[PDB]
């Protein structure tokens, strides 16, 4: 006995062959087991050399903060001698101490939004959902 | 050797603290909605005001 | 995000270490005379401090 909200979330029209004891817990357990089985089947099918047909390796995306980028763009360090001298001193000290060899540039790393891969992918998914599987809902 | 290792660890900790803690807060202080979304009615025989508001939200 | 000064931190760490040494000395001089397990020389101090596996490995 599924409510219409539960029924409309099933991907297709499925046939029931067993009589289950009445109650909400059994129905929820059946739905959870179905979701787990579908996810396991999808992952196993994908890992069985199915990525050969479709392989989309997208990575190396660098996210830069809008506020920090605008703030450091509005700063003019080279039109005046004193500002240039102060910027040179700070750049020397930062490159000596702050900048790691793995960083491309001090200016680039200054405005970079330091995000982990998982956070970046979650942000991409969230933006996709905002702008726009089988058993995700 | 212990003194130099401690200096190296202090340098690493200073770099981590500078990049993760100080500069974002400094920029945020340098520069310087949802509550409307939390109010359902913000955009638009005898009963009191609470009942009418509840009925209008129920219609919403 | 306003941390304590490193000098004070290290000084207090050293003071805590010597305090721990004093506490260990007092605990030994109070409870170390009794015998809990005569087969392995397990005294009351180590037994009540939860360091029985230390004695088991030491034997």
């Amino acid at each position: 006995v599924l409510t219409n909200t539960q029924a409309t979330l099933l991907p297709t029209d499925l046939q029931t062959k067993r009589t289950i004891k009445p109650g909400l817990i059994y129905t929820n357990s059946a739905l959870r087991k179905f979701v787990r089985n579908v996810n396991t089947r999808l992952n196993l099918k994908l890992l069985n050399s199915k990525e050969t047909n479709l392989t989309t390796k997208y990575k190396s995306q660098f996210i830069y903060s809008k506020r920090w980028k605008s703030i450091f763009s509005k700063i003019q360090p080279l039109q005046n001698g004193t500002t240039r001298k102060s910027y040179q001193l700070f750049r020397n000290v930062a490159k000596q101490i702050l900048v790691t060899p793995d960083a491309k540039s001090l200016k680039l790393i200054t405005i970079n939004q330091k995000l982990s891969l998982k956070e970046r992918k979650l942000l991409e998914l969230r933006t996709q959902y905002n702008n726009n599987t089988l058993v995700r809902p | 050797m212990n003194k130099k290792l401690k200096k190296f660890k202090a340098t690493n900790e200073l770099r981590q603290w500078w990049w993760n803690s100080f500069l974002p807060r400094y920029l945020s202080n340098l520069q310087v909605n949802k509550n409307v979304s939390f109010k359902p009615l913000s955009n638009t025989m005898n009963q009191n005001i609470v009942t009418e508001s509840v009925k209008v939200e129920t219609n919403q | 995000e306003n941390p304590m000064d490193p000098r004070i931190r290290e000084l207090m760490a050293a003071e805590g270490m010597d305090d721990k040494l004093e506490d260990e000395g007092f605990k030994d001089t109070v409870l170390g005379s009794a015998i809990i397990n005569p087969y392995t020389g397990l005294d009351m101090k180590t037994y009540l401090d939860g360091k029985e596996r230390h004695q088991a490995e030491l034997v």
Partner: peptide, 29 residues
Amino acid sequence: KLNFVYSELFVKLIKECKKRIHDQTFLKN
């Protein structure tokens, strides 16, 4: 206006370094 920002960073950074790395009393302790 953000003309001073770099300066306010520099006078900070080295100062912080003095507190955290090249402090002889802290090393002694």
